[PDB]
Ligand code: HEM
Ligand code: HEM
Ligand SMILES: Oc1ccc(-n2ccnc2)cc1
């Protein structure tokens with residue numbers, strides 16, 4: 001077996017041109033090939049401009065349309081994603097001009113607003129600036145945009161056991177811990193390679209389904225993966241879908257009763273129909289990363 | 301003399317409760333004693349929960365923090381390890397929820413990525429699921445994560461003489477032998493007691509220092525030892541440090557010239573300083589095991 005690593009790690013220098021160029025050329029071919037027999041002269045013109053740009057700046061910028069295509073192909077290329085059957089139902093937010101953690105926060109607020117849509121969940125991805133030298137990365141330190149804290153004496157955990165470590169990190173970063181079963185964690189946002197800053201999510205932005213005391217948030221958003229395309233790496237690119245029912249009877253009932261989208265049969269059929277409507281190593285690809293608190297060099 | 305065996309062998313049944321319990325109790329004491337005079341009520345609460353768990357499930361689970369403490373104390377307890385002077389400089393990856401060999405492979409990929417760190421080596425250990433009945437062991441059959449193959453007519457060996465036997469095993473397992481001096485061996489990974497599966501390491505994951513033709517890999521990682529803690533046994537727990545210069549002038553020069561960490565005086569001083577920064581029979585312990593191809597019962 002020759003599996004590939006599903007993880008893409010940090011860099012300390014820009015991707016070498018002899019490495020970047022072949023990957024860019026190949027992505028551009030994939031993009032223009034999606035037009036089948038059309039746009040040969042456009043394809044060649046784009047190859048030229050991208051090459052000059054790489055040779056002159058050391059890197060290159062995707063067009064918006066190339067970016068959109070890439071986010072959708074990367075989704076189509078996600079082996080375990082059940083939602084990838086309707087990969088054309090994806091809203092893209094272009095945050096590649098983002099500079100600060102405060103601005104990252106506002107972009108994420110918009111994403112959560114749009115995607116949650118009062119319960120009528122819509123799939124979205126927000127793409128922050130691409131990796132340059134690897135010393136100025138944008139990262140979300142959260143695993144998901146919305147997730148409950150987990151607190152550890154008897155060895156048992158209150159909250160989400162999966163967030164024990166990250167929760168402790170937020171505390172260490174000055175976040176004030178409640179100790180409930182359902183405390184929504186703050187966003188921990190890193191911009192331009194700087195130390196991360198901590199932002200509470202406005203509670204009204206968090207839609208929850210009450211199930212006994214049980215409760216859960218409506219929006220499943222992956223915060224911590226990296227988008228690769230044409231040799232470019234985007235270490236900050238949160239995306240969301242909607243929940244599968246499986247990840248109990250009460251749950252399937254409560255989401256449906258509160259009108260929050262889940263992947264039931266009707267939704268599967270509806271979203272696939274909408275997908276077919278739009279019809280009028282793997283790359284690009286979403287990689288896992290190393291948890292950033294294990295690799296970050298603190299400014300202070 | 302009453303030396304202890306440095307080897308810990310296989311089991312065919314779970315550790316008996318009358319044996320496990322005293323060891324768990326003692327480890328918990330060691331863990332809470334590291335808090336000196338604090339957390340007496342927490343200590344007692346943990347003793348209770350661990351005992352009930354052992355009595356009800358036949359075993360118990362460490363908290364993440366207990367696991368981390370154990371990996372570091374086991375390192376501190378390693379008699380021949382020169383690096384143990386800075387035992388607090390250890391990154392822990394928790395893979396105790398691993399199920400398959402494919403997943404083991406991805407965890408090891410992450411470990412190699414993190415630890416190699418483009419040459420700025422960082423010490424890490426990845427802990428796979430603990431032994432249950434001894435019939436579902438996770439094992440790495442390699443002695444090191446990265447090591448060159450050794451090929452034997454005149455009785456001389458091409459490659460690493462220390463891997464003659466394991467190399468032959470990989471071939472028997474269907475791995476296609478080149479016959480160079482520096483062929484990186486595949487990972488041979490056993491999950492849940494099943495027959496091992498063979499995985500080529502992605503070449504880009506392997507950092508090498510070119511010294512004449514001489515060459516060598518940057519990352520020294522022990523693949524085949526067992527971590528013991530509180531009566532629990534972890535038969536798969538690869539860890540790495542960085543090389544000592546001694547294990548030639550050209551070598552010390554080439555690593556330093558390519559910026560790959562070795563235990564020179566500066567590094568010794570730097571890592572010890574970082575260690576002191578963190579300051580704000582033996583158990584736990586790393587045991588040797590019997591080479592698994594000598595004990596494994598083939599499913600097919
Ligand atoms: C519209 C609803 C969607 C559904 C129902 C869905 C469902 C899932 C499920 C069930 C998994 C597997 C998780 C596990 O292993 O337990 C998954 C993984 C994943 N999803 Fe989605 N997803 C959706 C949208 C998206 C979107 C919009 C993207 C990205 C543009 C995406 C990218 C991924 C990736 C990269 C993974 C993990 C890697 C892998 O699949 O191997 N998904 N998704
Ligand atoms: C950071 C750099 C490190 C250095 C320079 C270092 C160096 C060494 C050396 C020189 C040996 C002796 C090998 C021989 O006998 O020829 C050794 C053995 C060993 N090391 Fe390390 N080591 C490091 C990190 C680690 C880590 C991270 C662990 C585990 C968490 C570890 C655990 C051991 C064990 C168990 C042995 C063999 C048993 C024994 O010491 O008797 N070492 N190490
Ligand atoms: O913990 C999570 C959350 C959301 C996930 N997801 C959303 C869309 N696709 C996967 C996956 C895993």
Ligand SMILES: Oc1ccc(-n2ccnc2)cc1
Nearest residue numbers: 444520521522539540541542
């Ligand atoms: O053959 C090896 C490789 C690495 C080793 N090591 C790494 C860290 N500590 C020991 C020891 C022996």
